[PDB]
Amino acid sequence: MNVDPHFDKFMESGIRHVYMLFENKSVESSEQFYSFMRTTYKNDPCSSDFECIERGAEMAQSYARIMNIKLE
Amino acid sequence: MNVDPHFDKFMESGIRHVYMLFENKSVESSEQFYSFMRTTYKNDPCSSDFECIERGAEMAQSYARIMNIKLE
Amino acid sequence: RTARFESVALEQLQIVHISSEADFSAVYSFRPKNLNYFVDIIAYEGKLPSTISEKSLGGYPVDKTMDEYTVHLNGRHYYSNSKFAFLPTKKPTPEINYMYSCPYFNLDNIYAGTITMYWYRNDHISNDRLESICAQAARILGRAK
Amino acid sequence: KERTARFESVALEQLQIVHISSEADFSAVYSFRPKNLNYFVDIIAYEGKLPSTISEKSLGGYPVDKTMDEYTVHLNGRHYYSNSKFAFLPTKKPTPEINYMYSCPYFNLDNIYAGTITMYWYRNDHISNDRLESICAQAARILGRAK
């Protein structure tokens, strides 16, 4: 696709390191998560491959605790 | 890209053989063009590179003559 | 939202399911638009494979690196014995002997999901009838949005 | 609708900042159409001295060549600079009067490649790529929110 390579790094890292452990995946849980990852990114974008892979991980990780989401 | 690859071959054929020779390009002229190409494709898609390259060109040139668009 | 796409995803999967005489058939649909991070089942027919039976069939992450995704972007159909990229589970599903699928592209000409047929028995009609059943439904979903 | 008309007000604001602080000779905001597809590129605002190869003609509805380096470098996450390749300059002719281009992509609310901020020089002294980088990047963040 023609995607922001940085958001797509940041988003894919969020999904593979956190979101795929979610025990309860559904339509609106993915959209809340996407809406948070998108707004977070857009207010303070990461600037590089290495910076994105790891801000995506630890922010998805934060999201998990904020809205208190069951993992493993 | 994650564009329908057959429409993409078809649309880029029309662009690289015909639309590029339009002497008066504009926001509108390019809007009508893509709108015609999308309608024609979606009503009767091609299913082949060699076909798509070739129909895209003919339809474009046909659109050109239909609308009386200056070439060269 | 405007549904309407799902009214058409139902009608076409009906035709696809019965004509292919598959055991289980589903319309998968990508989200968000043009980024394809998640895949949902928005309509199925037949009996669900044991791996997705009493589980949410929506919001499953898209692995863009599996074969089916890349093959659909080249514009050909995909079939397989043991690879179900989009089926909403991590567990394998060895009770599936065969899967055949074709992409559909929306009105903006972008990969928007798949129409997919599954067999529990190892017999199935020819791939050539599978193709034309598939392509004719793909064309209709594409116009529907 | 007039979503674009609002985006144009911001585009004009950010282009002013970029052109003057970069000291460029010619500055442009380019904007792809249709959404997500990018078959066409338009100058929606410019500053400075129009190069001769695009005076007196239309700066809209020019076709996009996606095999050109700048399109793919942008999609790989980098700024683009060159002293001869002007992928998006609405003309099929070369423009030897241009000594240097510098450009960074911007991306819209949907995170799609939606256009570029580009500076151009006719002299061959330009401020360092390092200053242009952060100049271009800060305006890119703001265009990206302007939907």
Curated annotation (Swiss-Prot), chains A, B:
Native source species: Enterobacteria phage T4 (Bacteriophage T4)
GO cellular component: host cell periplasmic space; host cell plasma membrane
Disulfide bonds: C46-C52
Name under which the protein is recorded: Antiholin
Effect noted on mutating C52S: Complete loss of lysis
Keywords: Cytolysis, Disulfide bond, DNA-binding, Host cell lysis by virus, Host periplasm, Signal, Viral release from host cell
Modifications after synthesis and translation: Disulfide bond is required for functionality.
Self-association and partners: Homotetramer; in free-form. Homomultimer. Heterotetramer composed of 2 holin and 2 antiholin. The holin-antiholin complex binds dsDNA. Interacts (via C-terminus) with holin (via C-terminus); this interaction blocks the holin homomultimerization and delays the host cell lysis.
Family statement: Belongs to the T4likevirus antiholin family.
Compartment(s) where it occurs, according to its Swiss-Prot or TrEMBL record: Host periplasm
Biological function: Involved in lysis inhibition. Senses superinfections and inhibits the holin, thereby delaying the host cell lysis timing. The genomic DNA from the superinfecting phage bound to the complex holin-antiholin probably serves as a signal for the lysis inhibition and blocks the holin multimerization.
Gene Ontology terms, MF aspect: DNA binding; molecular function inhibitor activity
GO BP terms in the entry: killing of cells of another organism
